[PDB]
Amino acid sequence: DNQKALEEQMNSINSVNDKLNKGKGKLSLSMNGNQLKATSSNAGYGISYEDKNWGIFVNGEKVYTFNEKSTVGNISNDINKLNIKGMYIEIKQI
């Protein structure tokens, strides 16, 4: 019944999922349309990756902010709790 996740999920959430992670620590994310889910270790976390910034935007609005040192692994954890969404973009009205 909750399978509706896929629909809300867009191949884009894939490249990204793998993007936000290219050598940090031991972290494995999962792709759920409106949710992210991962687990990780903070041993070799974002090493080569000094203190760099990331910014996520939903409906064209922030939705979560983390640094590369903050080792998202730790973060993305809490984050997922905001059960992101799939496809929403927009315009602001006065």
Q: What are phi and psi of 5, to 5 degrees?
A: -55, -55
Smallest gap from Cβ 28 to its own copies, in A, equals 19
Smallest gap from Cβ 61 to its own copies, in A, equals 7
Q: How far apart are CA 57 and CA 40, in angstroms?
A: 23
Interacting positions 25-64 with its own copies (CB under 8 A): 52-61
Q: How far apart are CA 76 and CA 70, in angstroms?
A: 10
Interacting positions 66-85 with its own copies (CB under 8 A): 68
Beta-carbon-side half-sphere exposure of residue 58 (alpha carbons within 13 Å): 13
Residue 89 as a binder of its own copies (CB under 8 A): the answer is yes
Total residues contacting its own copies by CB under 8 A comes to 23
Q: How far apart are CA 33 and CA 41, in angstroms?
A: 24
Which is closer to its own copies, CB of 1 or CB of 15?
15
Residues in the site for its own copies, rule: CB under 8 A? 12, 16, 19-20, 52-61, 68, 87-94
